[PDB]
């Protein structure tokens, strides 16, 4: 590579071809894997010159090389991205979205994705400068298959950054504007486009129920459920995230997920060899068992209660904690017959085993579930049978020990249980 000093001499030469050669040299320096000298390039004052080269319509090579150099400065820290924005790059890149040269308009898409990806303020500023209409215009083709794969992947990722981040969430009118295009990308056949479309949907559904409703109304749940069964882990992860977000919403929003057949995929998700997939699938289950009694019944009907017993029995501890929540939700909302069923599936022994955890919150969750199960047992007059079960698999030992526990709610719920049933 060139030195930064030589790049500066070329860029300050006032000879457009010398400036092109030095901009290309900078692009190569900034494209190296180990520690590209971004700050040295910023300190040398080169950003405003790069930004002015974005406007040289008669020299499309220097437009491309500067766009690439600025993309890579903006891919850095927030302070580095700020230096690019402060140089005037946002309106200059938006102008380039119209370039007749596909490789230049693509580089402008990529640069705007890095700027918007910095955070909600720069995402919103990219939107205020008018990026959404020209971005969407690049995808206004009858069939996405006619576009180059790399080009489409970059556009999808850039749109996902316009969906990303909270405090605030993206402007409602901007979301409404992008969503039809996002739904087309969600039906495309390329694995990377599908993964970034799912991530964008997972960001739009990460928020209040009004934001979930905007997405659900576009009819995407069936396609998300199909992507839940993809063989590519990079697709399953965000598709499950988005479905999990959606079932944190109203009971009607949760019912769309069940109606689209999502629960049939959960035997595999709840046994997935990727720990994070098991964890988020169990989290999703816990929000479904916080639903209506007819939604609990669908969990039962799909055979999923043995799978919750299994994850409660053996899983990463974080997954076991989501399974505990799923059990407490189930027993808090369920009918007596549904709670009887849960006990017949074997829930008591793995519940009791988890009471040796050194995590105060899971103990509270488990003691809540035990109390809910006892309350069901009182309506059957079978509290005595339950106490025996709980003693026989070692739970009474631990419940008694928890009377001596430091946390207040723990020893209180613990003492109550023994006074009332033991």
């Amino acid at each position: 590579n060139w030195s930064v000093e030589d790049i500066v001499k070329g860029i300050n030469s006032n000879n457009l071809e010398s400036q092109l050669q030095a901009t290309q040299a900078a692009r190569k320096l900034l494209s190296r894997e180990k520690q590209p000298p971004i700050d040295n390039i910023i300190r040398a004052g080169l950003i405003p010159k790069f930004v002015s080269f974005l406007g040289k319509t008669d020299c499309s090579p220097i437009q491309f090389e500067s766009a690439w150099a600025l993309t890579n400065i903006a891919s850095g820290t927030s302070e580095q991205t700020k230096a690019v924005v402060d140089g005037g790059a946002i309106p200059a890149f938006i102008s380039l979205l119209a370039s007749p040269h596909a490789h230049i308009s693509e580089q402008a898409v990529w640069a705007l994705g890095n700027i918007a990806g910095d955070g909600s303020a720069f995402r919103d500023l990219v939107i205020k400068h008018g990026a959404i209409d020209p971005l969407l215009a690049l995808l206004a083709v009858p069939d996405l298959s006619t576009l180059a794969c790399g080009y489409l992947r970059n556009l999808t990722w850039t749109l996902s950054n316009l969906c990303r981040n909270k405090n605030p969430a993206p402007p409602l009118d901007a979301v409404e504007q992008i969503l039809p295009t996002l739904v087309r990308l969600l039906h495309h056949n390329d694995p990377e486009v599908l993964a970034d479309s799912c991530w964008a949907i997972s960001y739009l559904t990460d928020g209040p129920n009004e934001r979930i409703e905007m997405v659900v109304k576009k009819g995407v749940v069936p396609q998300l459920v199909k992507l839940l069964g993809a063989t590519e882990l990079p697709i399953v992860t965000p598709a499950l995230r988005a479905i999990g977000n959606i079932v944190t919403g109203t009971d009607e929003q949760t019912q769309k997920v069940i109606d689209a057949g999502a629960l049939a995929v959960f035997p595999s998700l709840l046994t997935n060899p990727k720990t994070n997939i098991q964890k988020e699938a169990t989290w999703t289950m816990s929000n479904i068992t916080a639903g209506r009694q007819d939604q609990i019944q669908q969990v039962v009907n799909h055979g999923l209660v043995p799978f919750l017993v299994g994850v409660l029995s053996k899983a990463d501890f974080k997954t076991q904690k989501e399974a505990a929540w799923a059990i407490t939700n189930y027993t808090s909302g369920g009918t007596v017959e549904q709670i009887v069923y849960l006990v017949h599936c074997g829930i008591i022994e793995p519940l009791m085993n988890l009471l040796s955890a050194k995590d105060t919150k899971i103990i509270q969750v488990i003691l809540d579930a035990i109390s809910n199960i006892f309350q069901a047992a009182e309506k059957l007059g079978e509290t005595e049978k339950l106490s025996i079960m709980i003693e026989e698999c070692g739970g009474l030992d631990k419940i008694e020990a928890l009377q001596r526990h430091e946390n207040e709610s723990v020893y209180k719920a613990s003492l109550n249980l023994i006074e009332k049933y033991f």
């Binding site: 950054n161 991530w199 939700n329 808090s332």
Partner: peptide, 22 residues
């Protein structure tokens, strides 16, 4: 009541920035 939103960190989301290496 009962529903629990998931609080994610940056590491649990797709990367927000990408440099072009070639």
């Amino acid at each position: 009541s009962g529903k629990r939103k998931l609080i994610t960190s940056e590491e649990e989301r797709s990367p927000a920035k990408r440099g072009r290496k070639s």
